[PDB]
């Protein structure tokens, strides 16, 4: 179920989205933990704070 | 399981956190959808974008 937010990300869904760093560590991050939207995660590269 | 993030919020957990607006609409929001941490949600008031 969606919440009152205009852009509800449905944290209640049965799927967890991930994104991998391109900066060099090559590690996997939960998208919500690093504050990226599925759009961001797919349309551009991702550089974690340790590789930044 | 935790991801590579230093502060993993475990979106994989079996619980969903919510926060209610104090601005007037009195509506409920999923905390991740509005970008608030459990700490923020508990230690101060919450005013949604529509009530801001």
């Amino acid at each position: 179920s969606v919440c009152a937010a205009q852009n509800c990300q449905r944290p209640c869904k049965d799927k967890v989205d991930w994104v991998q760093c391109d900066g060099g560590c090559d590690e996997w991050f939960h998208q919500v933990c690093v504050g990226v939207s599925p759009e961001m995660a797919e349309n551009e590269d991702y550089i974690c704070i340790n590789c930044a | 399981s935790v991801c590579a993030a230093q502060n993993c919020q475990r979106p994989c957990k079996d619980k969903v956190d919510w926060v209610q607006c104090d601005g007037g609409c009195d509506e409920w929001f999923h905390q991740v959808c509005v970008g608030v941490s459990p700490e923020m949600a508990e230690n101060e008031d919450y005013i949604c974008i529509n009530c801001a």
Partner: peptide, 8 residues
């Protein structure tokens, strides 16, 4: 970036 989805 490289992405993936897992369960729940």
């Amino acid at each position: 970036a490289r992405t993936k989805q897992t369960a729940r």
